[PDB]
Amino acid sequence: AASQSTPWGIKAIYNNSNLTSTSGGAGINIAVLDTGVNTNHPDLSNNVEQCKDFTVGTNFTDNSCTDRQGHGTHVAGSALANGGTGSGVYGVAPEADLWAYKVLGDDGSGYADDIAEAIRHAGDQATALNTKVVINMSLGSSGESSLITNAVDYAYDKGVLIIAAAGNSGPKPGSIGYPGALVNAVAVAALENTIQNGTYRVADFSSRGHKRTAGDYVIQKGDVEISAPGAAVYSTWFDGGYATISGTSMASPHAAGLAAKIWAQSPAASNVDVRGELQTRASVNDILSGNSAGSGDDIASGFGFAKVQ
Ligand SMILES: [Ca+2]
Ligand SMILES: [Ca+2]
Ligand SMILES: [Ca+2]
Ligand SMILES: [Ca+2]
Ligand code: NA
């Protein structure tokens, strides 16, 4: 079984120190584009809906999404782990549907064309099934791939909400990477379990946005958008057990899970509506600590820390 039911970041985003379980996300699909997912993990299996591998062949191999690294399983767990039979770990939106899309191939990892194909496929599925999709991309690079960018824009136009890691190249200004830095991706900064200046603190490793476009509460290319728990995050692992790691990769699925929880309560809302709700929620929880964090919209934390309550 798990040694934690509700990890610190789950409790933090739920804003409840004694939380024993989570809820919500019904009907919303979280597409975790990553190293795959262990679809037999007891705390994930019941939420598995799609399992597709974009690293073998084109376009993809169906009914296949094996994680041999752990990242994708970890990320999926933060987003939507369901506690198993009651003794396992819980993620933010335990009633969401998991679409495990393997885009980081064994081993080493990820070609831009595989990632782009998966982003487009998620958009095509949103359209074909008339269903709501939140993409999570817990991945990043300093360089902008036009294949990935164009795929993001394509999916966003089709109504898909795209959440991504800000990157782990902080704390210096302008360290945000891609796809996080795209105007149609929600870049998520990583918080650590430290309260400073009254708020959770942005981790030093978390990539910062650019000074010239910050402070306006309007997202341009290069802006960090919201913050979520990303340091020392316990979650599911590819072996059917658990692991504790740190990264903006860990923050992203907290936000993707929250987005799904929000969306499930307004299922006819657009991606733009749900994104706006995340922005609003973040803005009332202004993050005030971490390098370059301060009052208002800043390059460390964007608008703030969107929560359940
Ligand atoms: Ca579904
Ligand atoms: Ca390929
Ligand atoms: Ca801005
Ligand atoms: Ca702030
Ligand atoms: Na962005």
Side-chain angles (χ1 to χ4, degrees):
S3 58
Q4 315 185 207
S5 299
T6 52
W8 83 262
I10 297 308
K11 293 191 172 84
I13 199 162
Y14 263 74
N15 202 176
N16 183 347
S17 305
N18 296 117
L19 196 81
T20 50
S21 70
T22 53
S23 68
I28 308 301
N29 310 285
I30 303 177
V32 176
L33 277 58
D34 212 303
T35 61
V37 181
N38 179 359
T39 54
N40 296 318
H41 194 289
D43 304 339
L44 300 173
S45 179
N46 244 52
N47 283 333
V48 173
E49 192 167 78
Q50 298 198 188
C51 170
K52 297 175 173 169
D53 188 353
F54 293 82
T55 73
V56 172
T58 37
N59 294 259
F60 63 89
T61 298
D62 209 356
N63 299 302
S64 187
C65 59
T66 303
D67 189 9
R68 296 169 179 111
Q69 284 269 62
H71 296 183
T73 300
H74 197 289
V75 169
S78 296
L80 54 60
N82 64 12
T85 56
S87 296
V89 79
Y90 285 92
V92 176
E95 298 173 51
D97 300 342
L98 175 60
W99 294 7
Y101 284 11
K102 184 173 183 178
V103 308
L104 303 182
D106 320 293
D107 236 48
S109 277
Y111 299 108
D113 44 29
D114 294 347
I115 296 159
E117 183 70 3
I119 295 165
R120 293 179 55 88
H121 186 61
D124 289 339
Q125 288 287 289
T127 298
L129 303 186
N130 193 32
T131 195
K132 300 308 202 176
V133 179
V134 181
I135 287 173
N136 185 88
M137 285 187 282
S138 285
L139 58 84
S141 147
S142 53
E144 186 180 356
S145 158
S146 58
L147 289 171
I148 290 167
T149 290
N150 291 349
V152 166
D153 295 332
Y154 175 87
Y156 195 85
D157 174 77
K158 291 181 148 268
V160 177
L161 183 61
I162 298 106
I163 313 299
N168 296 345
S169 296
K172 292 182 80 167
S175 50
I176 190 179
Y178 295 92
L182 298 176
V183 77
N184 290 329
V186 174
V188 185
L191 301 170
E192 64 195 10
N193 195 9
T194 298
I195 299 293
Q196 176 174 98
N197 307 329
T199 76
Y200 285 102
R201 181 177 187 275
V202 182
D204 294 354
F205 70 76
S206 190
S207 288
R208 269 60 176 175
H210 295 271
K211 299 194 185 177
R212 64 185 74 192
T213 56
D216 61 349
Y217 284 102
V218 172
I219 300 294
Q220 295 91 22
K221 188 175 185 178
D223 290 345
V224 171
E225 190 149 343
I226 65 179
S227 301
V233 173
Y234 175 90
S235 189
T236 49
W237 203 239
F238 78 90
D239 61 353
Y242 306 86
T244 303
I245 52 170
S246 302
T248 52
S249 281
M250 284 61 261
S252 188
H254 282 90
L258 185 58
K261 190 172 168 68
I262 291 166
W263 215 341
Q265 295 318 300
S266 309
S270 63
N271 51 344
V272 178
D273 296 331
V274 174
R275 184 178 189 178
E277 181 64 19
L278 288 172
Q279 285 170 12
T280 295
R281 287 193 187 198
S283 296
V284 314
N285 290 310
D286 192 353
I287 290 290
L288 298 173
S289 55
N291 296 16
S292 304
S295 303
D297 170 22
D298 60 64
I299 62 176
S301 62
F303 297 6
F305 179 8
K307 296 186 201 180
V308 171
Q309 92 194 163

